[PDB]
Design a protein around this ligand. Structure first.
Ligand SMILES: O=C(N[C@H]1CC[C@H](Oc2ccc(C(=O)O)cc2)CC1)N[C@]12C[C@H]3C[C@H](C[C@H](C3)C1)C2
Ligand SMILES: O=C(N[C@H]1CC[C@H](Oc2ccc(C(=O)O)cc2)CC1)N[C@]12C[C@H]3C[C@H](C[C@H](C3)C1)C2
Lengths: 546, 546
């Protein structure tokens, strides 16, 4: 019958509570017990703190009123406050110490996932201090995980006034018996309980969570590690930049701080970085996830030479120029990974740092055509099949659902044989016509790629493979160079085409190269091991790209 | 007959030249004259420096080769280099000291304006040093002002090889006698001169510019102060964010660093900030210029209540949330200026700093309806005319060209009388049917506004005026508050509706308010005095919003 869960901020979703810091300051300063809490509440509904919580005055206007409340309390208590007493210092440290209670947030996320409406109902102030950014940052991280955020200072009502609970019920469109309410202050539970709501008094998180599992019938404690927060395309800021008359690049943007450009592989989308876009923004970076040329909402000219590495890299520099970015960190995977190594070799001044997932830095061999080196390895046979225009397009566009379901698979789910593709006469010759859904992706995620490839088709994406000779000649120009800017190479143990051993001689070209390695990871790295990728990238960015 | 002008970077568009720093280091370190310049050129076409300029090796790979060239030169000269000798330190300081030669750039801009094709042809390197950002930043500022940028390390050719001059002519589609070429190194002029090009040897800027005026017949020296760099809409990154199901906000974005949100007034566009968008990005800020709700590419629902201040401010906070910005500096003008004061009063944590152009902070009077206060001032009579839905829309939409030409005027060009608008029966009753073009705007600029208002119309924009009672009730909630975050009020001397005297009691509400004042400036501040606005905003941002 329960369908809504309301949480308080201070003491429930964020720890420690302000009141806890007030009690700890009395002990540290050897003041009489409760003196700071008495000054805090002095006057009740007509006092300074109620005016602050109703949004009548701001935090800075309240600080001198709280200080005089402290002196009046000490006069009565017959004590002297220390020579260096400051409400501002005490409050700054208290607000700064507050961190998200991860287990409490994890339980809130699981409830919403199972169909619950979630909300935060809190008594808070209009923060105008010089350090107010810390509070804003915390609220933003929490905001995206709940259906509603109700703050006292915005609605002009405070807990425990009964009208704020009537307002809460009208916002949720729910009756009181369909609501569970969590708060660390007993007084605030009393009116919710009077209306008939299920209340949980929060003293310690683990006990609070056990009461919550019992009443909802959903397991919250001891639960498996969840996947990182993913992107909803319709909630993203969508950017459009024209780099040349017929070419427009589309990107998705989130966060503030140093620019980080993400470059996908074949046959993918900006959406392949869905698990890293919120994580990198939260770590303090401005993320720009591209639809590469030939894909999604980016332009897709039909000409083959529009997709050679030289044209592609030049358009990426123009993209930075039109956005007003002197530098960006470049992170690529698959074809995008090959492109970022060549961005570092040809435009080092525009690249703050460079990282590749799966794709090693392959220097051109001046004594051998790339097409002849492809024939030496039977694993690369699918590349020869991709050369004839129209042939692979017809097979991949014939059934879009089948195409993405057969390709996007974890290492133990492979349904295609990438060798003898030419001899068989296709990629899907001895392949099931209706493949099973991989554990890595959902039907909804697959349908995004199907919808994006319904507009463009496979011509543009396949053309990245039809410039082998042209790319080989261009790469030969960089044979005497070394990559001396910060660099990261991440290998994936189970990629059968881009094997980790293909990257072993990279130190000869990138002497101070840093490495990452992911076990039990196939070709589709970002969606196969999203947590591991996030950890490797965030640690490297914080040490080498700052 | 001349139609193209080519400039060198080092020693021409950027001063001082690297070679100058090399000569100054020999004097400072008491080394034999020319020793550093000999090591620099050692080997000619087969030497390290030619390999560096052709892009064969990077700057970091070259530094140890230049150092051994310095030792071999000192062995022959029978001298000992100082114990602390470092090519890296010498080059870092030389590159860092280089600044744009403003008079040279100003002359290049004027030539392009008068129909010339402009280009930079330079001998440069692939910069992979840890400080390479400084070079990237400089190149970006220059890049946007020229038709072509040709760098030796990218084309694999160097000056003075004759092939690089053939490549230059083929890029410009011009014959040698149609080209003027400026360089500070005589050797590089020789091959251009052989082809028949007009060459100018640059020793000092003023003499170089006088030779350039004589040969082009265009005055470059002693010229009036130009207007700041303006925006070309088709070259901007366009962003689209959905803040609620039927409401999508459009914005234009440029630069990196702290976020600065620009909010236009009535009846304007993001385009009203065209003169400040490049300046604020160049000062080190990430600019977001909005199309406010009801305007341009932003949604325009017809309902009146969709434009009350409360809804408008809430959508601006959502806009920051979807972009991943915890804070932004808010700068508004006219209706946008009124909105940013209320953003600071209602959401101080999301506002880093707040600035208003023309619009004073007007606190609500609880003892008087806003409509009655409007009737007390005959200047505000046009506001009563705007109340009836459909009436002002029909008059303003009847002829879009006339509407924008009659409104956008400098202080001494007024063609409308904003008082007795109701008694006359319209805004354009005794107004010319074909007004003259104001000196403030061009026909092309006017046509942008006409094109944008052809889609939306005036319903949405006029609805900002049809919520007087609703805005008054909402504002009354903030009567006990003070604005204690960094704030700037800019007054415009000749605004006859928003007079500077209307802002005199603002210190009572914003005690540490900073002020700006612009003389001989009418209502349309950004386009009336763009240089003055830029200077006031950049100085305040650097001191109070950093
Ligand atoms: O071919 C390239 N990727 C393919 C993309 C599709 C994938 O299909 C798969 C992947 C996995 C499975 C499975 O587990 O069943 C099946 C099919 C196979 C690899 N990328 C490059 C990237 C650079 C430049 C050039 C040469 C070299 C280095 C490889 C192309
Ligand atoms: O009415 C507002 N601006 C008008 C916009 C159009 C302009 O038309 C002009 C301007 C100049 C000239 C000329 O030189 O001939 C002619 C017409 C007149 C002023 N803005 C507000 C902004 C806030 C909120 C509310 C009340 C008060 C404070 C004024 C609206």
């Amino acid at each position: 019958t329960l369908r809504a869960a309301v949480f308080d901020l201070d003491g429930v979703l964020a720890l420690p509570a302000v009141f806890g810091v007030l009690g700890r300051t009395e002990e540290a300063l050897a003041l009489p017990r409760g003196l700071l809490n008495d000054a805090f509440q002095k006057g009740g509904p007509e006092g300074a703190t109620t005016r602050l919580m109703k949004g009548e005055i701001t935090l800075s206007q309240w600080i001198p009123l709280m200080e005089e409340n402290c002196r009046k309390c000490s006069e009565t208590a017959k004590v002297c406050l220390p020579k260096n007493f400051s409400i501002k210092e005490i409050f700054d440290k208290a607000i700064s110490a507050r961190k998200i209670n991860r287990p409490m947030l994890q339980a809130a996320l699981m409830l919403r996932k199972k169909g619950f409406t979630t909300a935060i109902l809190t008594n808070t102030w209009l923060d105008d201090r010089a350090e107010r950014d810390g509070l804003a940052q915390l609220m933003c991280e929490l905001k995206m995980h709940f259906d509603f955020l109700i703050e006292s200072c915005q609605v002009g009502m405070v807990k425990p006034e009964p009208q704020i609970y009537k307002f809460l019920l009208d916002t949720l469109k729910a009756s009181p018996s369909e609501v569970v309410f969590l708060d660390d202050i007993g007084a605030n539970l009393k009116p919710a309980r009077d209306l008939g709501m299920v209340t949980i008094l929060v003293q310690d998180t683990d006990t609070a969570l056990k009461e919550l599992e019992k009443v909802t019938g959903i397991q919250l404690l001891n639960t498996p590690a969840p996947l990182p927060t993913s992107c909803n395309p319709s909630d993203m800021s969508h950017g459009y930049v024209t780099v040349k008359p017929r070419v427009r690049l589309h990107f998705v943007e989130l966060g503030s701080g140093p620019a980080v450009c993400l470059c996908h592989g074949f046959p993918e989308s900006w959406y392949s970085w869905r698990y890293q876009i919120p994580a990198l923004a939260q770590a303090g970076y401005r993320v720009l996830a591209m639809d590469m040329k030939g894909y999604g909402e980016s332009s897709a000219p039909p000409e083959i030479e529009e997709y050679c590495m030289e044209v592609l890299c030049k358009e990426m520099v123009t993209f930075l120029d039109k956005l007003g970015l002197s530098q960006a960190v470049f992170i690529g995977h698959d074809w995008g990974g090959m492109l970022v190594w060549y961005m570092a070799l040809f435009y080092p001044e525009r690249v703050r740092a460079v990282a590749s997932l799966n794709t090693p830095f392959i220097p051109a061999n001046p004594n051998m055509s790339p097409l002849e080196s492809i024939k030496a390895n039977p694993v690369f046979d699918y590349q020869l099949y991709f050369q004839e225009p129209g042939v692979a397009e017809a097979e991949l566009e014939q059934n879009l659902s089948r195409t993405f379901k057969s390709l996007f698979r974890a290492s133990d789910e492979s349904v295609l044989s990438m060798h003898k593709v030419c001899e068989a006469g296709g990629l899907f010759v001895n392949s099931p016509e209706e493949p099973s859904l991989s554990r890595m992706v959902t039907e909804e995620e697959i349908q995004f790629y199907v919808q994006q490839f319904k507009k463009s088709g496979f011509r543009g994406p396949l053309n990245w493979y039809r410039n082998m000779e042209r790319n080989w000649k261009w790469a030969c120009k960089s044979l005497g160079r070394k990559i001396l800017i910060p660099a990261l190479m991440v290998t994936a143990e189970k990629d059968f085409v881009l094997v980790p051993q293909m990257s072993q001689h990279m130190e000869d070209w990138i002497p101070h190269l840093k490495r990452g390695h992911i076990e039990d990871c196939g070709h589709w790295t970002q969606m196969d091991k999203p947590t591991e990728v996030n950890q490797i990238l965030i640690k490297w960015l914080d040490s080498d790209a700052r």
